[PDB]
């Protein structure tokens, strides 16, 4: 089980968090598709905004740690993609 699968399972009781994670999942799928780069960036930006506030709202615990790790990774993926697009 990946960290992401586990985060999703810990989020089973929190629809807003699941939904933001699904938008992030769509971003990553778009990054793999021909012509998908701008859609990926838009999905990354939107999900990240939501996830940052959800992270601020999260009480301390394993789910917060997983969410922080995922947010850092998503931000880095989006940053790298943005640089690739800028060329």
């Amino acid at each position: 089980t990946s960290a992401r699968d586990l985060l999703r399972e810990m989020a089973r009781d929190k629809p807003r968090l699941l939904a933001a994670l699904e938008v992030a999942s769509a971003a990553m799928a778009k990054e793999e598709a021909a012509g998908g780069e701008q859609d990926a960036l838009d999905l990354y930006q939107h999900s990240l905004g939501e996830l940052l506030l959800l992270l601020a709202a999260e009480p301390p615990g394993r789910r917060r740690e997983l969410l922080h790790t995922e947010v850092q990774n998503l931000m880095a993926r989006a940053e790298y993609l943005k640089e690739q697009v800028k060329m």
Binding site: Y44, Q45, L48, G49, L52, L55, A56, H68, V71, M75, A78, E79, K82
Partner: peptide
């Protein structure tokens, strides 16, 4: 400790 200052800076930069 989460560095929200770093994350908020990076987020504004990304958004453009």
């Amino acid at each position: 400790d989460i560095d929200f200052d770093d994350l908020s800076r990076r987020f504004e930069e990304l958004k453009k």
